Structure 1
Amino acid sequence: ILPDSVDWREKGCVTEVKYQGSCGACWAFSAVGALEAQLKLKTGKLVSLSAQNLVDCSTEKYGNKGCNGGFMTTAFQYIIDNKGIDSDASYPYKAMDQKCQYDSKYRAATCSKYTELPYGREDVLKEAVANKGPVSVGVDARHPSFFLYRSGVYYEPSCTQNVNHGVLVVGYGDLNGKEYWLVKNSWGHNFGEEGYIRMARNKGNHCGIASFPSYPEI
């Protein structure tokens, strides 16, 4: 029943690619990206949400360390606990750790729950991407080839299932006989294909893409 390919950009559910700079905030970008799609699905409005709000506010209580890393799932829980997250416009990204400056007057989204998908199951990830929306994932992005990706479907024999980088699966498909996951990164539009990378799909949980998937709901 699932479509052979999905691209949530086609449905206007994906915001512009962001640039995290020298702050290890990929986790926060991944989390807001997933929530941005849900916000569009629920309200019809596409709005960039504040990764900085997560960096500054979803901190020790959530096991997160701001520019030194965090979890997408615990970011979602912060949004639930906090009863909101501010817009990116209201609480802009500065690529540094700041005091928490959340203000409900700038709230642009809420979250009521999140779901973690079973480990390594690319079929379940496919179903979620098709039926729920973009899914936050971790990948192994440590390998020099990752940084140099320009086009095609990324396959790195040295990749592992030990994830170190938080990104957003916004689709899937097949290109020239290679199944892929369409991944939104947060290293700006210079990276890959305008900020995206197509990563090998159904190749044994390549780079751990299906290791730790999660998605929020509004």
Structure 2
Amino acid sequence: PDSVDYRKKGYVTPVKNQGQCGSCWAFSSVGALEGQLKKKTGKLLNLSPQNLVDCVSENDGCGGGYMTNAFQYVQKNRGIDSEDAYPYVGQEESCMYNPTGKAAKCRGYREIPEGNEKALKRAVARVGPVSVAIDASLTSFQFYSKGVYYDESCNSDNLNHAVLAVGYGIQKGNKHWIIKNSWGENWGNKGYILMARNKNNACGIANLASFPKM
């Protein structure tokens, strides 16, 4: 069955709203972690993006960052706090990681071969929700609400926004990826957007994908 929806499997936490802070990579990172945590312990809980924003020295907090740097941070740190133990405030602050708030661990990360949607698909099915980067600068993207998103003008080399691939499927002859955003439930469709799958790596959905080894 060429389709899977981790939201129905209970691997995806409610949709979050990151505000203006450039923490998309943090929500994307916790997103993937929340999925592997659910898979391993059968427990579904919100992880702390604020933990990453203030602690991942390789990234730039509200200035932007890479998900792989984030996963690496949790691995070396041997842990990441839950959302409730280290609440999101929308601004970079000093690193306040607390071991008693440790909700999950991480053992490293794997990166899907660049631009290989076929591989990306395999990873989503085999491992679970995958962290991915895309060009989210278009107005068509930001005004998405229904259907399968596909805009030619999307620049697969202009990766600038981080999101989460929680699955994939097909709608009326248009294959797609089920993508979790971090702009609240009022954006897109209950917070999600279906992005063109197999339509020439649209928006570069497969140029920078990865998940945490748990």
TM-score, normalised relative to structure 2: 0.98
Equivalent residue for 2:137, pick from 118, 135, 142:
142
In the TM superposition, what whole-angstrom CA distance separates every residue of 1:194-216 from its partner, at most 9, and x where no partner exists? Answer: 11000000000000000110001
Distance between the aligned counterparts of 2:71 and 2:77, measured in 1? 10
Give the corresponding residue for 2:15. 17
Distance between the aligned counterparts of 1:195 and 1:211, measured in 2? 23
Distance between the aligned counterparts of 2:197 and 2:155, measured in 1? 14
Structure 1 residue 177: deviation in Å?
0.6
Distance between the aligned counterparts of 1:53 and 1:135, measured in 2? 20
Equivalent residue for 1:115, pick from 110, 124, 149:
110
Unpaired runs of at least 5, structure 2? none
Distance between the aligned counterparts of 1:71 and 1:113, measured in 2? 14
Structure 1 residue 19: deviation in Å?
0.3
Equivalent residue for 1:176, pick from 152, 172, 190:
172
Distance between the aligned counterparts of 1:122 and 1:203, measured in 2? 9
Instruction: Give the alignment's Cα RMSD to 1 decimal.
Output: 0.6
Structure 1 runs (4+) deviating above 6 angstroms are none
- What secondary structure does 1:194 align onto? coil
Work out whether 1:188 is the aligned partner of 2:184. yes
Equivalent residue for 2:195, pick from 189, 199, 205:
199
Q: Percent identity?
A: 59
Amino acid at match of 1:34: A
Amino acid at match of 2:81: D
Give the corresponding residue for 1:49. 47
Amino acid at match of 2:184: G
Give the corresponding residue for 2:162. 166
Give the corresponding residue for 1:58. 56
In the TM superposition, what whole-angstrom CA distance separates every residue of 1:30-75 from its partner, at most 9, and x where no partner exists? Answer: 000001000000001001100000000002xx2x100010100000
Give the corresponding residue for 1:35. 33
- What secondary structure does 1:67 align onto? helix
Distance between the aligned counterparts of 2:83 and 2:213, measured in 1? 19
Equivalent residue for 1:127, pick from 113, 117, 122:
122
Give the corresponding residue for 2:94. 99
- What secondary structure does 1:73 align onto? helix
Structure 1 residue 217: deviation in Å?
1.9
Amino acid at match of 1:214: S
